RNA sequence: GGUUAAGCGACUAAGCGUACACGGUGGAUGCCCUGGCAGUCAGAGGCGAUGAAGGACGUGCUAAUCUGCGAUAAGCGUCGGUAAGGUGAUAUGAACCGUUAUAACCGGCGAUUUCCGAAUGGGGAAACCCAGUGUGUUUCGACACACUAUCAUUAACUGAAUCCAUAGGUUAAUGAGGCGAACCGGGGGAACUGAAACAUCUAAGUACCCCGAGGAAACCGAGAUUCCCCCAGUAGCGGCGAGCGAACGGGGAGCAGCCCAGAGCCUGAAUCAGUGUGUGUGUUAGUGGAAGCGUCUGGAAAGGCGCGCGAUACAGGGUGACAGCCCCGUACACAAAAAUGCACAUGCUGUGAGCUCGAUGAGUAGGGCGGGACACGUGGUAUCCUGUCUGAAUAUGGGGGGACCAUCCUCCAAGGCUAAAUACUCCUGACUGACCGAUAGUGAACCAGUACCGUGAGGGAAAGGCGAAAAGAACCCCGGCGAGGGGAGUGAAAAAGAACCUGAAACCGUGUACGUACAAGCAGUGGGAGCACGCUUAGGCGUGUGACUGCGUACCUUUUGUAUAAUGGGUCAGCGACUUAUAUUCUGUAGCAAGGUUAACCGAAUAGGGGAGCCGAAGGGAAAAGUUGCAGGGUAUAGACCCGAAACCCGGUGAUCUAGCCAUGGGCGACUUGUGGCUGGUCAAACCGGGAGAUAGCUGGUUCUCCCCGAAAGCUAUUUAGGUAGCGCCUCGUGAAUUCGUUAUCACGGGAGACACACGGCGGGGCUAACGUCCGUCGUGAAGAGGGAAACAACCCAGACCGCCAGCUAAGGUCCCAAAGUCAUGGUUAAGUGGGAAACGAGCGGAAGAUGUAACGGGGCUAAACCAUGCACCGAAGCUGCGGCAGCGACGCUUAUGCGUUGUUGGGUAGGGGAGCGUUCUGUAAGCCUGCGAAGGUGUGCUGUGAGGCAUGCUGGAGGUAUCAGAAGUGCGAAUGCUGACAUAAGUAACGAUAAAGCGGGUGAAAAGCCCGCUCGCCGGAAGACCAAGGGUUCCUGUCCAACGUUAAUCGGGGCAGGGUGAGUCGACCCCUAAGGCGAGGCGUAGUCGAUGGGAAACAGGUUAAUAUUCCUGUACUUGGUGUUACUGGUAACAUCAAAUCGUACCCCAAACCGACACGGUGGUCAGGUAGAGAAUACCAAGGCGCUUGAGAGAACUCGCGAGACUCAGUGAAAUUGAACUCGCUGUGAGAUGCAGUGUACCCGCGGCUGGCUGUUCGCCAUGAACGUCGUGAGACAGUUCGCCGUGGGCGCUGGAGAACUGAGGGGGGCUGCUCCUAGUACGAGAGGACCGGAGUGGACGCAUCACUGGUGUUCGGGUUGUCAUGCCAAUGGCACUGCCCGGUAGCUAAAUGCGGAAGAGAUAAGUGCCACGAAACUUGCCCCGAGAUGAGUUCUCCCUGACCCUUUAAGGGUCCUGAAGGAACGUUGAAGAC
């Protein structure tokens, strides 16, 4: 089948779409010898020979991990001011990369998923799937049980009547409380904009459970967890795509707990690494 | 001798790993095969309206299949050869026939030779249904036989528009509308590979397909034709790119050259053919046919020894082991009732010669008007075909002689024919081979054009190793009247017993010996100790096992690196990606010496004979004295080192199913059903076969072994780009001069690959401002062993051929780990300096920073460090010594290597050069070996520097091999390779589209679940039954339990046997009619056909073990013929006779059928009784029957004491993973489970591994700049936050068991607040105001809490609508969630009462004095835990008298006898309470 030229050089370990167009316009990488034109499409077949600016790159398994993004980081790559991001701890791949799913702010933590294919990263964001996820809200201010039922109905926000679904109580008698709000529409930052109407200011938003992936009880900040085969096959057939039978994860169920402990050690290590990069 | 203490020290494995012997699942290899591919010497190329090829049933004395056969049904008549046997085979028995000439089998000549398929009477579904017309007939009611869909030709007869002719119809005869290969011809017609680019071109008048025919097709000469052998990869043609592509002569004759235009004198002539008979010679079925007697070994003789016959015949195979002569086949000698072919007697019909007299081919050529095909668009344009309208000549016109004009001869237009060889191999017989032997060869060696799958078509698996002869287990024992196994018997052999000759690797077990429960994470070899079965007249000699130590960052592919969180393979066995054919060029080998070579054809078939070509023989000279094959080594081209491409084109399936529109027939209003027509940008040009075993140069992959040697990094010229000329140094061969003591240098020939650089010292280059960028060889971090810096291939050191318990260096170093001065002489001796860097100030503090120490690889080090000088040891595979300096290359002594020495020595991909084996087939080789035991497989030993070969033993019992050569499907570790046989994951997960289990009895060796019986409630106008499809014996009965079924399954929906379902009034066939079709002429009429309505009848009951409305019995109605009566052939009454075929059960609303879990779709018919307006609701009635399987316990969540989930008998999985004896942290190199160093482990499990936190946006505590969608730079979509720490069984701590203590190390016992008195205070002239110590009152539950004060509370006070119990009611109790619950005692749970963490004492940092003080983290000591703490203690009561032999006489073991204290035990036990 025929595909776009800017898409083949996207997941191969180069750039995205606008960055690839800035390279083919100067006369660097070319297909079949002649200089290709922007906006065309060719048939990708395992047999072509191209050189990325005079460098032979062999371009021909999907891996999805769960990184949790603490405070003081960015979900992008380049930054005009030079703030640290999240693409500084991902391992290197041979002819592959990682594609983030979603977008968060600085004061909004969450468990992001980094996939390899660009098609699956655009299905979970579309409202056609509607996946329910769990969040942990740590309120701090004047809040009672009378305002918990008013925000569950139609409340005017600024663009659309944003509301919640189910609000429970799981302890919280000291200085803060636990208002586990369940959401399923997605959007981008739809919890802080609803609690600022009262004394609540939303100090930190931490994501707990996403869809049906079991959260490992004992995972500190600064570190990614690669999902096994039994976990990546759930979100694959959830949309349209058939499940893949080829992977890399075997058993290592005790080797995996070794992972847990040594990795808590190495998250301490990566905090040290961020300090050093400072 | 007895007791006590200390050190060393036999004995605990339910497992895992290793070796020998003994089995099984699995059936490889060797060997064996009436079956093939491919050629030659004779032949054959058929069958085709008296019924084909390919294909269901029926047929034997018999239950069935294939071949064959057709109620005259593997048999019969006539005519021939052998008569001591047969009724085909798989595959035996039972039943018959033949014996002084009626058996069977083979060949020839006749009769006979279904429905259906080209099928002709009309439809049609290849085996469903009806025959139309005309005779005879012991059967006016029954059968058989014969003739007729067409077109064309000949003859006879008849006949319209339209007087003649012509169309149509009838009869007879001849001819044939059939199917499956190769090759040839005619009419049409493709894609892909390399094309510098492009509709130029090659591939390619091709593959495939249609019709028809044939047996094969179509300036020196000379006028049947074609093919093969030559001229010839030629003379020509093309952007003269790759390609395509002729003739004469000659070398070879396996050719044979006819008839008509013919009058006349003369015919059954000469040369020949067709149709009969007779003789002679052949082909196609048969018979006779010579030649080994015996003995030893062995159960058995085809081979051995001695003596012979035979040999025109030993071509091959079978006959108990390897066969001339024991059989079946070959020389020689004979037969003709039928048919056919090649020379010859006679006969009938025959297109017909010689001599004489004549002739040598008119609608043609050329020209004019209007088109197309010949490469050429109507060109400068030749040649080929010429409709309609026209039109010449016969040396006064035309062509040819290797084509200007001219001359002479031949030729100058419509005729009719021409064999064999050569092409082609689907069928028969004989013969042949350096082809193969069940993953080979063909899809297929047997029941392979198979089981199975799909709507049809296309395409498409596995499976014999039966034995010489079936001698294929009588009887007895166990068990279930089985399966399986053990004895006996038979046989040479029984681990070959219906998986059946020999039985490997891998996987899975038993017995013996060794190691492991304190061991170091893909650890193997070596060194060393202990122990066992055979060293052995002391000899730790060898193998397996082998605690502990030392050395070493596994292996392959892919790479600038592979020790990597970057990627690939589960293993074993079998199989697997030829360097061939056809040109040219180059090299090596060998025969006449100035004839080196022939191909095809021919030949006593490789020699002889034959020179028309290719390669050469006139050099010197710019120009005007050797070659052909085979083999080996390269390039290009039919596929050519290419596993599955994708896309496009061509040849057979494209309105069938779903969803619509116009015209609708019936049954009861946008209903439903059946048929037909119209509409192809997903059934809208899917798949398979042919092209095509095509094609993407890279990606995966150039495969077994072996000796020597061996090109590159960021580059140069510099265009036009993933490329053309070209690279010093280096290789093989040749040439080779002191050129730069075996050619290191120059030239020539052959083979024809890569390309991001980075750091440090010295020397150079933007503001040496940036520790960057830009340059050179060996050389630490990435195509060079090992050693050293803790480890390795971008500065250190070294050219590593092989053996050993040898000695001596350099770099790095010398305290221990771990072999290397605890050295000597001068300095240094309190900043953890020795364990980084800049600038500023005067060898110190030295951004002097958390590499388990408040920054060396480890423990340390206050000099045990560093610099300089002098003196030792240790230091690889270098130098040296010994042995062949194994192997290769020279000189000096030597003509086919016995050298006395020295030097280069295993870095490497691609490529190139010299010396290589094993296995299989043939000549060598009918020889030799060959039952005192072959080959292969399976062990050990010996030999060899190469892959190996030779011998012997066990198993096995039938044909095998070496030397001198040559020809290939040729040595296997991976391509997710393909086939077959097998693990871990795991004896675990799972028990599902949801009515409910349990109790009793009977059968059986075994009954949780199957069968049978009783009561209430889940199913129940449908989870029911009866019709129409699909299926065509799944429904009844009996026996059996291997396979089939999600467990069991004595049941059954499984197999076998028995048992097929009564039809003129059960359903309607045939025929007629409507819509919709077909319809000879013409381009829909006349007809032929086509129904769920109209079309004679029966509504009901009884009788089955299984299926009925039918037979028996009772009653009713109608349509023909015949006989009688009545009325005038028809009608009525009575009686008698006849009336075909097909379908038929179970299933039919989800079980028996179609998607594996009714993870749904599913036409149509019947709405009973009571109540109600109706089809809701009410009596959930009757009938069919009541999830496909159990027992305890009964969280959170969910549904309403129950129903699920989790843990358990039995049965019973997949994905992933190269393989396991699954150890942290720091550090190194782009996030280390596996290397090195330190701390810590008996095996199998479960629970821990950013709310414990923050008084309110900020701080603390570490268990239009992006990331993705697609889009022909066209922009939108939506979318952007902008093993360790702990807890349980079975064990151990020195034979063993039940307690109480001492308590190493860590989280835990050291965490918080207010008031009053001391105290308007110490110090101070005032104000503000102490510190320490003591008491009391608050948070958090530190263990709690029952006298009193609360709450909760399924066995007791105490009620209540209805119902139930005590006989009924009341008075008392219990059930529908604990029906709503109203109160309380004891045990448990708590917001209140008592006690209780800030101590007493000792030791620190910071801070404060001149030893004295010293905090919430540390320590005897105030809660609590703890001896798996391997370093492992003491006391204390106890527990603790059975013996005889063998032997190497000792920490020993076995048999007979015995079973203690304590612990362990689960039918005699639930106020103990989720588990």
**Closest CA relative to residue A11, chosen from A75, A111, A93:** A93
Q: Rounded to an integer, what distance in angstroms lies between the CA atom of residue A247 and that of residue A250? A: 8
Side-by-side strand order, sheet with A99-101: A99-101, A110-115, A65-69, A224-226
CA–C1' distance A112–B497 (Å)? Answer: 72
Note the strand B nucleotides within 7 A of protein beta carbons: 565-568, 645-646, 696-699, 721-722, 755-756, 985, 1215-1217, 1222-1227, 1230-1231, 1233, 1248-1251, 1253-1258, 1262-1263, 1265-1274, 1278-1283
A66-125 residues near strand B (Cβ < 7 Å) = 75-80, 89-94, 97, 99-100, 103-108, 118-119, 121-122, 125
Q: Rounded to an integer, what distance in angstroms lies between the CA atom of residue A263 and that of residue A260? A: 5
Using DSSP's 3-state secondary structure scheme, residue A67 falls into strand
**Closest CA relative to residue A64, chosen from A114, A125, A14:** A114
For the beta carbon of residue A126, count every other beta carbon within 10 angstroms: 10
> What are the angstrom distances between the C-alpha of A175 and each of A138, A141, A170, A197, A230?
10, 9, 14, 20, 40
Catalytic annotation present for A105: yes
Resolution in A: 5.0
Which residue is associated with the tokens 């996946």? A131
Q: In the complex, which nucleotide's C1' lies nearest to the CA atom of residue A107?
A: B1281
- Strand ranges (E), chain A: 2-4, 41-43, 65-69, 99-101, 110-115, 133-137, 166-167, 181-183, 205-210, 224-226
The experimental technique used to determine this model is: cryo-EM
φ, ψ dihedrals at A20, nearest 5°: -75, -35
Which residue is associated with the tokens 């189910």? A166
Q: Rounded to an integer, what distance in angstroms lies between the CA atom of residue A116 and that of residue A209? A: 22
Q: In the complex, which nucleotide's C1' lies nearest to the CA atom of residue A271?
A: B1262
φ, ψ dihedrals at A56, nearest 5°: -70, 120
Q: Which two tokens stand for residue A81?
A: 């001011």
A226 secondary structure, DSSP code:
E
**Closest CA relative to residue A28, chosen from A54, A6, A9:** A54
């Amino acid at each position: 089948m025929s595909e776009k030229l800017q898409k083949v050089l996207a997941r191969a370990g180069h750039g995205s779409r606008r960055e690839i167009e800035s390279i083919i316009e100067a006369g660097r990488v070319s297909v079949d010898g002649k200089i290709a034109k922007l906006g065309d499409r060719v048939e990708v077949t395992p047999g072509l020979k191209i050189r990325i600016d005079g460098h032979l790159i062999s371009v021909r398994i999907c891996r999805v991990l769960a990184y949790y993004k603490p405070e003081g980081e960015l979900c992008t790559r380049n930054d005009p001011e030079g703030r640290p991001t999240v693409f500084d701890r991902l391992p290197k791949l041979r002819g592959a990369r990682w594609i983030a799913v979603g977008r968060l702010d600085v004061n909004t933590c969450g468990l992001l998923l980094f996939t390899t294919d660009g098609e699956l990263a655009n299905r979970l964001m579309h409202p056609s799937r509607e996946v329910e996820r769990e969040y942990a809200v740590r309120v701090f201010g004047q809040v009672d049980d009378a305002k918990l039922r008013d925000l569950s109905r139609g409340v005017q926000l600024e663009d659309g009547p944003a509301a919640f679904k189910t609000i429970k109580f799981s302890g919280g008698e000291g200085i803060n409380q636990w208002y586990n709000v369940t959401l399923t529409e997605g959007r981008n930052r739809e919890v802080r904009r609803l609690w600022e109407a009262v004394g609540v200011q939303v100090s930190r938003l931490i994501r707990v459970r996403y869809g049906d992936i079991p959260l490992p009880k004992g995972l500190p900040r600064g570190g990614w967890t690669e999902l096994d085969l039994a976990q990546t096959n759930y979100l694959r057939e959830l949309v349209e795509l058939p499940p893949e039978t080829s992977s890399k994860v075997a058993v290592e169920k005790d080797r995996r707990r070794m992972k847990a402990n040594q990795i808590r050690r190495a998250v301490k290590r990566h905090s040290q690494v961020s300090g050093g990069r400072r």
